[PDB]
Design a protein around this nucleic acid. Sequence first.
RNA 1: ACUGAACUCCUCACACCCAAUUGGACCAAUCUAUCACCCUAUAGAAGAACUAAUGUUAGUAUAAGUAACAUGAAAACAUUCU
Lengths: 152, 108, 166, 148, 287, 304
Amino acid sequence: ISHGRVFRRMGLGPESRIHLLRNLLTGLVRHERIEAPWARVDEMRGYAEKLIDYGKLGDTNERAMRMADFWLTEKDLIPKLFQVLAPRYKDQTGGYTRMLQIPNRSLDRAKMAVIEYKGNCLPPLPLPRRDSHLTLLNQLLQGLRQDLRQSQ
Amino acid sequence: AAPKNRRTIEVNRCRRRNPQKLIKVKNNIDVCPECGHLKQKHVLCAYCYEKVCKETAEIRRQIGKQEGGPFKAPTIETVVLYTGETPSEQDQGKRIIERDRKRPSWFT
Amino acid sequence: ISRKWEKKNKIVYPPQLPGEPRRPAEIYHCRRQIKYSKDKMWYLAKLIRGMSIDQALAQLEFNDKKGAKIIKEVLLEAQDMAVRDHNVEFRSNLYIAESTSGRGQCLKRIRYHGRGRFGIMEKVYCHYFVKLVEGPPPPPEPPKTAVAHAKEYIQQLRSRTIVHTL
Amino acid sequence: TARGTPSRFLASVLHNGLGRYVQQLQRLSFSVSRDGASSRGAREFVEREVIDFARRNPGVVIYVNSRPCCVPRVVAEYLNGAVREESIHCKSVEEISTLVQKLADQSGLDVIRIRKPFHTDNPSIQGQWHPFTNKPTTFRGLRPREVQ
Amino acid sequence: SPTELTEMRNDLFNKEKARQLSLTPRTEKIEVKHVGKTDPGTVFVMNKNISTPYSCAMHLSEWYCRKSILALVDGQPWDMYKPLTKSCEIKFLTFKDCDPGEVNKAYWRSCAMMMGCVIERAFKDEYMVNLVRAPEVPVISGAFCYDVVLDSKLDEWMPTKENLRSFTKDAHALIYKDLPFETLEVEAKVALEIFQHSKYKVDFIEEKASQNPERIVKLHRIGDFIDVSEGPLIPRTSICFQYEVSAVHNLQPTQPSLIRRFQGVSLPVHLRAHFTIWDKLLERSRK
Amino acid sequence: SGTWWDEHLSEENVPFIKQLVSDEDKAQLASKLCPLKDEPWPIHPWEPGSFRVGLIALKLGMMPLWTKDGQKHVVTLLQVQDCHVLKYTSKENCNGKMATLSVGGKTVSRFRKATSILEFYRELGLPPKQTVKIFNITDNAAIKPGTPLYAAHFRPGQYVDVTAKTIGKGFQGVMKRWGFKGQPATHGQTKTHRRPGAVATGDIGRVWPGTKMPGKMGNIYRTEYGLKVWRINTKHNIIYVNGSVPGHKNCLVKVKDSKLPAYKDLGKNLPFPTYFPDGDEEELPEDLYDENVCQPGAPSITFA
RNA sequence: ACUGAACUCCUCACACCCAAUUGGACCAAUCUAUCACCCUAUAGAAGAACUAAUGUUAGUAUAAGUAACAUGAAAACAUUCU
Ligand SMILES: [Mg+2]
Ligand SMILES: [Mg+2]
Ligand SMILES: [Mg+2]
Ligand SMILES: [Mg+2]
Ligand SMILES: [Mg+2]
Ligand SMILES: [Mg+2]
Ligand SMILES: [Mg+2]
Ligand SMILES: [Mg+2]
Ligand SMILES: [Mg+2]
Ligand SMILES: [Mg+2]
Ligand SMILES: [Mg+2]
Ligand SMILES: [Mg+2]
Ligand SMILES: [Mg+2]
Ligand SMILES: [Mg+2]
Ligand SMILES: [Mg+2]
Ligand SMILES: [Zn+2]
């Protein structure tokens, strides 16, 4: 039974899980876009947003600094978090990362996912887009919307 | 615990040709509007993604070239400029990445 | 070994009379000595048996099995040669008529067990065979209706005779 | 066994003995060797018995081939279009004469299991049994427990 | 009798098609360059008047055959089964495109014509039914409509809910028939010969010939039913999935004659709506 | 090809459609607030032997409750959410012993329901409901479909039966499933700690039907009998039932009158068909308490 | 009263239902003498016939696509991290 269990069991155990996620997160901070197995990415996603929140909390803050020091193995990334990533997202209250499923891995046929920090410099992903408003169904519904607003 | 008797081809066929064993037909397959190659819905188009990844790799090679050695992550934002492009007011005070090719249509 | 499937494309039919329906083009193609189990290959062969060429290619493209890409390659080769050599009008206007796996020539190796004892390991090889036929894929056989069953049962009753009599 | 073998009903070719009896055997081909011990009996048959058989059965055409062969054969053809090949290899004159006469007597119908030892196209004269035979009619044709 | 009229119309249509087919200069070849985002710069070397855009799709893939609704030939809308005439640039238009306006119009017109066919065959022999036209009403309006003149006998008659259901069932039967949308490009005289009986059709053909520099008009056939169209149509009847005949309204200026406007709403297989959304579209289309 | 509702909708059409359908649901629910103003089915007085309809409630959770005697009783909170009568079936039509009322609870999405269910609810003029349960009633207890049901249907001091699917524990071994003692830890016991012992007897060359073996436990319907109603909260439609009911929190439970022979004919004081708020005779307070219940806001109890 | 066998009768036929053992009539294929010449004849010979030896060798099944086996992470694939 695993009712209300929120964390996956991965790696060689709890510490190993932390270390695996830490490496993925370090990769994400450096590269701003990471391919990895879907489950591992999904697990890391939460930590990614939390890290930005601690980044926002301030450079001078000792608590935030300690957290940043732990989660970023490469130390050059710690300035980047506080001075680049945190100021970028100052406007929005969340939804810093974007996760999309990728065609399965060649070797082991693993479910794969791309994770990026929003507003990166890199070429945009081929994101899924909803149908145009000018489609037949959308036209009919626009007609309906117009009729309803005219009624009021 | 060993088999008491050889299982026949009739019984074996029944086991291994069961619908449960069979491969299921997929209804997720649609044409990617951008390239015309087949994509599974809910999944990024393989062709389009490969294209984006190739460009990303090239930019990253250039990033590494400009940085020089490890532990040289900039403390400023980055922008990528292609041939016949100049930094704007926004692009001023950002790290400039130069590419030897033209702007892709999809890159905006 | 036998290689009859190859010789099937070498058949030449006499020219058709004007007052005759157009003969659908048949294409025979196989890959020999695929490093893959025939049993595993069978599932993929069965999958695409009734399908059109494009449907089959789509299904194979998004399959996770090793043999899927091999069948995809064979199908593409067959589609190409169909148009080029066998005078098929449209590359899309093809459907899989036959799709089969057969055993290949195999190699015996030794598998070491956890005493002096051992086992004989067999390196599996298989052939994939395909026949493509020009035209739309034939419609699947409709499920038997209540009226069809009823008719069949009446027919059974009407068929019966007084047995062991004059 | 029956389950392992085809079966047929008892039949005639064209209602053979109804109007007039017509001999079903049509042609009889013999392959005989001039030299060869197998065809010894066959030779003696051709010498003495075949002429008389031909006279007795004018409807049958007899062919005698007389060619080199290890086994002599008789091929019997019937009006229905059946062909029967019978080996007369190392058989006496008596045995061959017997076999040939049997072929003359036989029709072209297959020698398989015959399902019924009788066949009729009009089995009934008074009318085949149905449930309502041997049942009395009722007034107004009223069903049981019917008010009207 | 209606049967003899449709028979005669079919004979004339077939005769005209045969005439147009006969003047082909022995399977001439045309070069058709595909200009699209997908599979760029592919050329089709195809028959001058035998070949169609659908056969171009058949050269590419099944996906093109399935999804393509119209062909844009030299930037002009073109039926999938309409034969090509000259060396040209082709692209395929689907419902999913950024601006599917042309596809929307084509689908709308096609459904209008289908409804026309249905309502023609629907009424009894004793009653007289005369089809006026299919107005070019926008998709945003919510209902494709057709104008019909009925006999004086059914002036006081108003269709019931069951009657509308019956029209719907007939339309679904027509969908199930899976009939191609046959097209013909003719001189006015031929159209006049075909549509000599219906004065409304006469008038409509006259104005259509007038707007064109020549006297060239377009005709479309589903199955034993012929109608003159405003523009290009969808390839096949099977494209429609959800098809209901919404309502019938009497037009207000009924001084000379009484015209019924038949209104209905449709969506293709590609753009299937949920039961709930569909119910909203129905309740709007009745207005 | 597979399709969902918002597959083919635009960016701006999705919020519009959501709003439109939500508003229609709200309107339909609000429409049914006055059943007595609409043409009702005849209301009959209570008779011995009569059985009334029950409810479908959502299990909110548990809190402690105290009594004047000083004993603490844990109670379960059952919230009644959009509970309506859906269908009536006569005894002859049902081919059963009693007339039946189908009652639904907890409104759900229209987009996620089958066409058949959608059509049925469309005819009703109510948004679709998660679960429908059937209550066997007498003819005199018949209620017109569409009529809302409230927590005040039950009254404090009354006993109820509660039926729900139990918490699914998935595949379980004999020790957790049937409380088998298992085998000792040490003193040998090579591979036997949690295993079933002898499954059957030697002489029978088989295993009896219904032997206790490892399998799926939970996720089945169970009934808790003779649970006391301690308190009703009329404002939020809460029933406070004694002890624990089956199922997880936020599940849907079937609540009916107790079938136990002790509480056979205690339905005299209860509102017979149902409670109709629109009647508006002696408007009920926010909270209905049992005599023994220590009400919040009451002075501290002294055992005199 | 009737049913009821391989008993008995009936139409035709007849060597044609015991272990070990014993007597007899035939005979597959091969080689040789002499025949024969789309595959045989009369004789003489003999490594002269396999549903069975946990038989020998080889092939291929069953158990079974089972048991089991394998590559720390990201990435510019420079490198860095655990
Ligand atoms: Mg879980
Ligand atoms: Mg693991
Ligand atoms: Mg060793
Ligand atoms: Mg213990
Ligand atoms: Mg142990
Ligand atoms: Mg041990
Ligand atoms: Mg007897
Ligand atoms: Mg006997
Ligand atoms: Mg006897
Ligand atoms: Mg005897
Ligand atoms: Mg021997
Ligand atoms: Mg043997
Ligand atoms: Mg042996
Ligand atoms: Mg097993
Ligand atoms: Mg394992
Ligand atoms: Zn793409």
